[PDB]
RNA sequence: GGACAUACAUAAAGACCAGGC
């Protein structure tokens, strides 16, 4: 429901304009619930048919209609940055979350190359990144941007595979990689419910030929696994012994809010002012 | 991965009988 958007709109007030696309349903944009931000500065668009579309990011037509709409609403330049927080329930298949979400990862990366301006930025949620498919998608972003990193914020839960790819400075000439990833998404859609799938988007010999990329990718995965293993074992110990507690949670909270410049206040429904007093 | 039924209301009706001015 656009929690990420609320912070950006609240931080920049009206000096910002947001464009949204998400699946219609229980997890649609709750623009009414933006208590800290002016929801009028945001515009949801659900692909083909605009407001009446389904918002399927994996579907190409939703991407295309949104793509034309976003470029038009940005003087044909695109957005300064894209945020992407895609995920769905994998209840009882948590170990397969990467493989199950692979097309959603691709479509969010394709969306970055479709609507981010030159010199613009991208941030996308991902999970595990073990498969050559997911690593080849990160390699294409590393080619297309001045700088890329894999980052797990402390606001992500330590025991889950959730991390963010963060890309800074979209290069010129990314059109071929965009149109390639658009063709790969069409191929994934054709292979839905078949015994075949797209297993590579960059050859393993190309990825492993960049030793500097490969040495970062391995080290990022193994460091994340090591921290996730400790955090999973910690949760298991805190199930077995219910007297265990983190004593510093209230201290760490106060310091994080101070550091990030976030006021320590409760969520209050605006207040209803009358138009004369306001 | 909350109420004073402040509903004063039991008044059968109907009948005959007795008395009052």
UniProtKB/Swiss-Prot annotation:
GO cellular component: cytoplasm; intracellular membrane-bounded organelle; nucleoplasm; nucleus
GO biological process: 7-methylguanosine mRNA capping; methylation; mRNA processing
Catalytic residues of the enzyme: 85, 125 (proton acceptor)
A GO molecular-function annotation: mRNA (nucleoside-2'-O-)-methyltransferase activity
RrmJ-type SAM-dependent 2'-O-MTase domain location: 1-171
Amino acids binding S-adenosyl-L-methionine: 56-57
Induction field: By interferons alpha and beta, and by Vaccinia virus infection.
Residues that hold substrate according to the record: 95-97, 160
Signal peptide start and end residues: none
Alphabetically ordered keywords of this record: Acetylation, Methyltransferase, mRNA capping, mRNA processing, Nucleus, Phosphoprotein, S-adenosyl-L-methionine, Transferase
Compartment(s) where it occurs, according to its Swiss-Prot or TrEMBL record: Nucleus
Assembly behavior: Interacts with POLR2A (via C-terminus).
Role, per record: S-adenosyl-L-methionine-dependent methyltransferase that mediates mRNA cap1 2'-O-ribose methylation to the 5'-cap structure of mRNAs. Methylates the ribose of the first nucleotide of a m(7)GpppG-capped mRNA and small nuclear RNA (snRNA) to produce m(7)GpppRm (cap1). Displays a preference for cap0 transcripts. Cap1 modification is linked to higher levels of translation. May be involved in the interferon response pathway.
Entry protein name: Cap-specific mRNA (nucleoside-2'-O-)-methyltransferase 1
Species per Swiss-Prot/TrEMBL record: Homo sapiens
